[PDB]
Short mmCIF file of C-alpha atoms in Angstrom, two decimals:
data_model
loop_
_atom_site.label_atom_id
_atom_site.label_comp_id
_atom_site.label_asym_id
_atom_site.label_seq_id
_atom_site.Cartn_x
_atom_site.Cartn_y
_atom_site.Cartn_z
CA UNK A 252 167.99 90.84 -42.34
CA UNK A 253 169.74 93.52 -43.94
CA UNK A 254 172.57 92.50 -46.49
CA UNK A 255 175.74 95.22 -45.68
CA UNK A 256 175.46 96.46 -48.85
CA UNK A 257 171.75 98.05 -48.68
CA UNK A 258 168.91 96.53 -49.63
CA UNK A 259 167.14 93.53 -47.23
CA UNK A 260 165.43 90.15 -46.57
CA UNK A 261 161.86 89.81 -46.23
CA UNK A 262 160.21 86.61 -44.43
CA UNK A 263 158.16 86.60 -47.96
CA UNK A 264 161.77 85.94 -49.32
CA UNK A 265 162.50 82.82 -46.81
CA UNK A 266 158.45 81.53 -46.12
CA UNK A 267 154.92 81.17 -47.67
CA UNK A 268 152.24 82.93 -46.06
CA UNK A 269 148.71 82.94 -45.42
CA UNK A 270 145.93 82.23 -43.30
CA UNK A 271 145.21 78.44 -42.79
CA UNK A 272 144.10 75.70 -40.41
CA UNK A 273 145.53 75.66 -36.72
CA UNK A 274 145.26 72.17 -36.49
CA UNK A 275 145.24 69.43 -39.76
CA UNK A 276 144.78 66.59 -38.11
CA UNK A 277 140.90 66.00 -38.31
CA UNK A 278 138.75 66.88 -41.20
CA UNK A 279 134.95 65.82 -41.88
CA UNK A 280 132.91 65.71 -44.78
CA UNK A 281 128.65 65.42 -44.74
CA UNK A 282 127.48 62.74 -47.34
CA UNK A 283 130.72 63.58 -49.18
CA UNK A 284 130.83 67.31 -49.57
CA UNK A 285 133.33 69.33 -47.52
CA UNK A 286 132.19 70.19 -43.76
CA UNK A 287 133.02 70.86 -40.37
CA UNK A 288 131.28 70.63 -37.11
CA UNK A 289 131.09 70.82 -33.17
CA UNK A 290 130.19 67.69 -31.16
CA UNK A 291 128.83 68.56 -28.01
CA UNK A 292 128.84 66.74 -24.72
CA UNK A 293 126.27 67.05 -22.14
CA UNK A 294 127.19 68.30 -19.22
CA UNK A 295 127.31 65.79 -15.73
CA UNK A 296 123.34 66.19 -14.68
CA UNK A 297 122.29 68.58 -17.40
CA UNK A 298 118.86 67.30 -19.55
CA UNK A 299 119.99 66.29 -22.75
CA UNK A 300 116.30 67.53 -24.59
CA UNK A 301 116.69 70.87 -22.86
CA UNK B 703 120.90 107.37 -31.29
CA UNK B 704 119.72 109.22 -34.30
CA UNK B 705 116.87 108.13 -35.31
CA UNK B 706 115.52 106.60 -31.17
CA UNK B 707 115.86 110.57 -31.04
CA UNK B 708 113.41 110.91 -33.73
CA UNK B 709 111.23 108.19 -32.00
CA UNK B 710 108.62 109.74 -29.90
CA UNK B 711 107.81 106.41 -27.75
CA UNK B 712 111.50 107.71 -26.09
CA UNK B 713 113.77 109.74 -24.53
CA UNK B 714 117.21 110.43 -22.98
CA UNK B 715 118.65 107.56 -25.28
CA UNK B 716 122.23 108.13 -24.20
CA UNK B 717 125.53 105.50 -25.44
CA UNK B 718 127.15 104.59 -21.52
CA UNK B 719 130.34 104.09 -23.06
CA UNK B 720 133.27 106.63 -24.03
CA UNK B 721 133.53 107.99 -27.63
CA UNK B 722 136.55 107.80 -29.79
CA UNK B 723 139.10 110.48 -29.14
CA UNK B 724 142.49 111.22 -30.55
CA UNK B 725 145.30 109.52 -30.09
CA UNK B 726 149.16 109.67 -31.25
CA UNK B 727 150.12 106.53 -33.63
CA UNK B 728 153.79 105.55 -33.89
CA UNK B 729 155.39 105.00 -36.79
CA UNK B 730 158.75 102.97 -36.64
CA UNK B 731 160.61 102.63 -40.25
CA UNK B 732 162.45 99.38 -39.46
CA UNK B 733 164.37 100.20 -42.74
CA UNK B 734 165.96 103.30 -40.80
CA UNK B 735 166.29 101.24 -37.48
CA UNK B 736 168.15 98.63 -39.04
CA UNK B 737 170.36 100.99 -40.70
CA UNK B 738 171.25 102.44 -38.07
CA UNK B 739 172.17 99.10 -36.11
CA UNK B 740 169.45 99.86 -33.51
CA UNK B 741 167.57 96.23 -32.65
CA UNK B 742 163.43 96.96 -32.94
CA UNK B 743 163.20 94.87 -29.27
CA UNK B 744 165.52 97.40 -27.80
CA UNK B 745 163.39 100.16 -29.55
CA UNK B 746 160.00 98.48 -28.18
CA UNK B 747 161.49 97.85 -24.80
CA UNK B 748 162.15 101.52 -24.76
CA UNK B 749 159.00 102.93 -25.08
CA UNK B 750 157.53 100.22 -22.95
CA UNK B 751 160.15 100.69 -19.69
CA UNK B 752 160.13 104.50 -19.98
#
């Protein structure tokens, strides 16, 4: 927005900004330190060593 | 490219895509815009539709 008397507002005026998660809800940690990963399901009549 | 060109094992080593060519940015000064009570959708939607 733009106050009638010059000058204007900036969403760095109303918010905080930056890049974070998309989703918080599930975290993971390997033998304590911080991690992520992908679990993967085999697909219907794949061959899981393959 | 140059340096296959400087390979004599081949030849003819062409890209198959385009290469970059010019093309005319728009700048919008939203300070301007807004000062002169002219939206910024209506601006967009102008230069989309026409």
């Amino acid at each position: 927005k733009v106050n009638p008397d010059g000058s204007q507002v900036r969403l760095k005026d109303v918010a905080d900004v930056g890049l974070g998660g998309q989703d918080y809800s599930i975290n993971a940690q390997f033998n304590g330190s911080p991690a992520s990963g992908i679990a993967i399901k085999l697909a219907t009549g794949a061959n899981a060593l393959d | 490219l140059m340096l296959a060109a400087q390979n004599p094992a081949l030849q003819r080593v062409r890209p198959n895509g385009m290469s970059d060519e010019p093309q005319y940015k728009l700048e919008i000064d939203d300070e301007k815009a807004s000062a002169l009570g002219v939206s910024l959708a209506d601006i967009n939607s102008t230069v989309s539709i026409a």
